[PDB]
Design a protein around this ligand. Sequence first.
Ligand SMILES: OC[C@H]1O[C@H](O[C@H]2[C@H](O)[C@@H](O)[C@@H](O)O[C@@H]2CO)[C@H](O)[C@@H](O)[C@@H]1O
Ligand SMILES: OC[C@H]1O[C@H](O[C@H]2[C@H](O)[C@@H](O)[C@@H](O)O[C@@H]2CO)[C@H](O)[C@@H](O)[C@@H]1O
Ligand SMILES: OC[C@H]1O[C@H](O[C@H]2[C@H](O)[C@@H](O)[C@@H](O)O[C@@H]2CO)[C@H](O)[C@@H](O)[C@@H]1O
Ligand code: NI
Ligand code: NI
Ligand code: NI
Ligand code: NI
Ligand code: NI
Ligand code: NI
Ligand code: NI
Ligand code: NI
Ligand code: NI
Lengths: 498, 497, 499
Amino acid sequence: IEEGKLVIWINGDKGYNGLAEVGKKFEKDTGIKVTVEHPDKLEEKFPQVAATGDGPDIIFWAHDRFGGYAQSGLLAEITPDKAFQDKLYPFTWDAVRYNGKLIAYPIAVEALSLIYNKDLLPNPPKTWEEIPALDKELKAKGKSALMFNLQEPYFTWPLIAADGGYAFKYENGKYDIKDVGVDNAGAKAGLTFLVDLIKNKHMNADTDYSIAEAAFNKGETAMTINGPWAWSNIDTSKVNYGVTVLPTFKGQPSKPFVGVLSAGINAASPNKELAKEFLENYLLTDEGLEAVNKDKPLGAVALKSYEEELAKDPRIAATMENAQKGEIMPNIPQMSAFWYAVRTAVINAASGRQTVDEALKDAQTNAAAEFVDISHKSFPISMPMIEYLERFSLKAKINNTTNLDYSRRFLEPFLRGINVVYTPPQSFQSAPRVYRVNGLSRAPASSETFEHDGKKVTIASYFHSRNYPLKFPQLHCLNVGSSIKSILLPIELCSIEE
Amino acid sequence: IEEGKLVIWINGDKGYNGLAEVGKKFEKDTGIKVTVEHPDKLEEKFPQVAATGDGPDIIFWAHDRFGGYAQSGLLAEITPDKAFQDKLYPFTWDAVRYNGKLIAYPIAVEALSLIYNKDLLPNPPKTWEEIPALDKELKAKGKSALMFNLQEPYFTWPLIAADGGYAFKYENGKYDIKDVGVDNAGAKAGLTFLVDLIKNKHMNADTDYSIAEAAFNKGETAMTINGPWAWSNIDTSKVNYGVTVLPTFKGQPSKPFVGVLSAGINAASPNKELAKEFLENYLLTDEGLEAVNKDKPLGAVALKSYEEELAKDPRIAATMENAQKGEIMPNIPQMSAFWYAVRTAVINAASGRQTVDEALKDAQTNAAAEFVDISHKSFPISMPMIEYLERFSLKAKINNTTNLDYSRRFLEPFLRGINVVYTPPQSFQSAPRVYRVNGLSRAPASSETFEHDGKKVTIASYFHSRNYPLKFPQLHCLNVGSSIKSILLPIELCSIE
Amino acid sequence: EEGKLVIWINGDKGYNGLAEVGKKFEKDTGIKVTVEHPDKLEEKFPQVAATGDGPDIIFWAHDRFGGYAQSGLLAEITPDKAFQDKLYPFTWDAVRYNGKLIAYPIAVEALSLIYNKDLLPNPPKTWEEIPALDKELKAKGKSALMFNLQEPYFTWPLIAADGGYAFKYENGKYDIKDVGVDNAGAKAGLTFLVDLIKNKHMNADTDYSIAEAAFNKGETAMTINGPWAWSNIDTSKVNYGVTVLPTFKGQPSKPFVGVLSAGINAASPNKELAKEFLENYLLTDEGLEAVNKDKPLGAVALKSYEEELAKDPRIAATMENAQKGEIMPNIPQMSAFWYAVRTAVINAASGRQTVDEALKDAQTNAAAEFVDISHKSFPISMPMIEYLERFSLKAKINNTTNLDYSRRFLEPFLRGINVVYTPPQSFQSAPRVYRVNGLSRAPASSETFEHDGKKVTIASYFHSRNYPLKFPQLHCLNVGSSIKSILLPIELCSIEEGQ
Ligand SMILES: OC[C@H]1O[C@H](O[C@H]2[C@H](O)[C@@H](O)[C@@H](O)O[C@@H]2CO)[C@H](O)[C@@H](O)[C@@H]1O
Ligand SMILES: OC[C@H]1O[C@H](O[C@H]2[C@H](O)[C@@H](O)[C@@H](O)O[C@@H]2CO)[C@H](O)[C@@H](O)[C@@H]1O
Ligand SMILES: OC[C@H]1O[C@H](O[C@H]2[C@H](O)[C@@H](O)[C@@H](O)O[C@@H]2CO)[C@H](O)[C@@H](O)[C@@H]1O
Ligand code: NI
Ligand code: NI
Ligand code: NI
Ligand code: NI
Ligand code: NI
Ligand code: NI
Ligand code: NI
Ligand code: NI
Ligand code: NI
């Protein structure tokens, strides 16, 4: 359902106005209109819509999400040749490599750094431990020492990880999804320190990206923790800021998860060729990145040529300095589970509604959860009524010959009371419904007859006429009506719970 | 006991005709004749013959056996340089690394997968649990759902291991041979499920590789469990088959032990140089592997270059998919003990002659069983009468000076009634015999005398003359003389059972 | 200390060479550099440095500095990136403790097998073949092997070969609860050693000196030592070779690798000079060259100098052995570890204890818990203020607290109590034990007394002696008796608690 043009989705904190300038340059050369949008929770919506075969042509996000997207077969395999692949840093390509295939074009490396107000904190803390005292000082002047987004775990992880916490252990080549370190000792310490700052009114548990960005830019707080994209607004606010290494905890460096802004091609986009033309020959160029970067900094771009010149910028330098101390995020499907599990954890712990231990316990459990067998798009868990009967009653597989008369005896008591979800063929343009099952029909669908507009027709017959030949015409149907006032449903179109 | 040529041993289920084509290509270039053979139970015979200094020049088998071979010093340390070592996947070299040394050339990764008849089972089971019902269906059409070699534990391990069973636990670096998991809960579950299929006539306990291969290829059974090497015959049989992931058990994936077909150089081969020339420059090449692979699939070869192209094959893909879910076998010496212990176990449990618990109990014991003093060489375990006296009577070690007169008091009552096994020196060309000990001799063997053909000689003297100088001439002998007619036997040639 | 430079390095090292550097430094700065090599320095430094004494610079293997740093006896060195890039990063790691750099890396050390070519042209490849080899040599009036058995350092390689280890390195750090000196692999190794001694293939009482002397006299075919040792061997004109340590059970010997490091005394007043000497004099090609020429450092840390000496097969074998072993942890628990293993090896080797007995204790002692770094002495004491808060008042005391409100229960709580009164240092007096009879009648600022015909309060008096009491309003502890009292301000008292 995607047109013959280009639609791009990138996160709002990014430079979409810049990316769009590039789009205009593209249209002026090809006539192809490029539209850029920045939907809320896009990393969340893309998967949903793209599953339907909808969504944008290009999707921009940190590489960590694409693995799951690729897994859900929502991304197209990009095809850059060696000539192009050599224009970017190999470690960037690694980030976008999933199952040996390249699933997106690397744009830039991102990493949270400590941003501070020089006019207030000319000499910024070197450790988290000294922050409390620092707050006292500033509080006396009607200010606070630190403020950063506490709603997103991304910003809190650096501290949690500093002294030992981690997502999934990287063992001889890959990630062991059984080994999760968010419940370990190191992680608790970190999370605890945080919780204490909140506890001792040195920070607000409900502080979010917005609250914090606005406070720092108004010069009400001495420090904040953010990424490159954030500098623009600070420039605008005329605040005299500095960007440096994140403080240490228990002498350890804060390990921020490093991200690679990447752009993937919608598996369903019909404009894949255009997509790559725009990405390879427009965005991923010095003039291209320059335009986006000028709206909102990308940080350390992936294009060797452009990164090479912007490298002199100490802000990027500190970015990379922090990157050094942290580690690139895995791109495995388990990541969203991880993030989701940690989000709630930090939050609640921080709110006091849960203890660090309680929180990280669940966190551990959830981040370690296993993927409930796919194709079970339901909850409570559903199961085809055919499978149901086979596994719990007939104790045998059903097929185009099965005769349920032989089983009436026990089947009937087994179906009495049963609530089922009848869902008609899509072509019927109708909707799923719940029905209570009173019992088995008297006869097979191919024998069970009814009349309308003065004509006698069998259920099987009817279905065939509506282009939905029943898989098992010889099976008795489920009676959802009653004795003579029956409503017969073919078992193959029904399912249950548990 | 060998020659200035090349003799190779590979298992019969492998592509020996292909390996041989390579051998011909080698001869045409060197003149060196390469002969390939496939003896029964070769993994078993190699050790025996190679011990004698005999056997083939090259030996082909799954890496798991070479550790024990290397340990028995039956394998030569191969010497491939970095240039070559980079041509194969490092994890393969790991498989063939023992005690830091490389003991064989990796050929290909193998892993059992689920093979099925599409014409019968277009949509194969995803779990073992649904197999029973499936058999019922097929049985009605004069077919069965599954059939695979039950004689070899290799084929049954995937299930046994799925829910927790394992060989030896890998702890921080290596394998703890004290920790064996074939007796655990997970293992029992799996073995039990199997036993039940047999129990409910869904499978035959006596089904072997042959029975099963033939049934599937005749299209009498919907599924089978086998390795790459097996596809060839299926091709030939024109059966429309598919290869996919092994079903799950208790929701767990079947963990097949993964193997690396490797080729080791006989420690005694005098053609080691030729050996490696053939292996490095002929077999381990695209054209080389291609020839063997065309006879019978190697699966996922070790040579990066060739594996790279055959990778597109979904069969290999499923192979590796199953490999993913299982784990490479250890190569430690304890493996054969493991295999042997599990073989009997599965078998017997499957036959009903033993319960899963009984079976796995022994299995555990045997796999874990400690070795026994290399000194003892036969069976029954006999205790030398010297050792016997030391440990139960003298409470002291005996030597070339010991005088038993000092012990007469208690030794005598200790020896009365005692039955002993006297066994003469081999050179005597006689035979072991049981004798009843009446007591200690009057004097030491070197003093105890007797006469024959009119000559006086001491026992010690006599033995020396027959080239068997007694170890302890000064010891008194054991009197076996039933009556006042003494029969003195030197203690060192006696033992108790 | 003074306004100069005093350095301590171990005697087996090249102190005469280090000193040559010192002279070069004085000739340029006028600052006199003195180098000393005290016995058991790794042991004395901590003791003296605690007092605020000791040398300015301390040289030792990196493994000891963690504990030093922990005891706050070392200063944080401040080399900039320009300098930090002149040395190998893995060296800096060795000297990094709690994220901070606590010393300047000098060189990587690792024990290697040294042998007499004229006797053993083809040295053993395994420990197992050593016994037989001894027999051969013994017939010629020589022995196969001889090395320091007094120090565990030399024995660890074998003990560790087949599995023994200090502390397991788990996902980032060392688990001090997981100690592997009592495991199966360790016993095997220790046992093999004990047997060599048992079968008179080696003397349990053989030490570094005995062994160095025997090899250099050409009485033993092999020895196990470090780079520093080659010099004397050169001097002895013995034709030696340096190679990989033999294997045990097919395993390589895992020698603990050390990084010779130099730390700045936390108390040195010449820290600036210290680093100037270290960064611009010692850690230079000409610098290391001087020390190295006295006694080899092995594989230095300065990329530039190590780069040229790398051609030396001796260093090569050093590193080859280093490869097979592993860098020592630098955690505080190390000395406990070393001390525990020292006795263990020794005794087992002497037969006064079985490998199992020995390694049992070793294990126990090694994974020993460390009490808080704050408590510097024994018996452990607790300030009487803290004591009252935590066990009686169940509340924090401050400049307002009035103990009258608590008399009721405080009194019974203090009767019998023995306390350690310790006067301000300026008082030039000494700590004393007193038994507490009870609380004073009034606060220190109200409690009065008279001398030389003058009335003064306790609070008043203290202030006059330049020791203004922290809590003038608190009642004092009465150590006197019926009307004949001795009042002590609680803040100057403490208790050494029981059991
Ligand atoms: O908070 C978890 C969140 O972390 C990362 O998202 C970053 C994103 O990469 C940055 O570009 C920036 O926009 O902020 C985000 C956090 O607000 C992960 O990429 C994301 O999947 C995860 O949910
Ligand atoms: O059943 C125990 C047996 O398992 C493995 O043998 C496999 C071999 O690896 C495959 O290549 C193929 O030949 O079939 C064998 C089972 O029939 C072990 O490699 C072997 O040592 C072990 O005894
Ligand atoms: O033996 C225990 C001892 O080992 C290490 O000391 C080594 C030192 O590193 C070497 O350079 C050489 O001098 O010999 C010493 C052993 O005699 C540790 O550094 C030390 O702390 C430990 O006690
Ligand atoms: Ni907006
Ligand atoms: Ni928006
Ligand atoms: Ni109608
Ligand atoms: Ni045959
Ligand atoms: Ni045969
Ligand atoms: Ni005769
Ligand atoms: Ni000295
Ligand atoms: Ni001295
Ligand atoms: Ni006076």
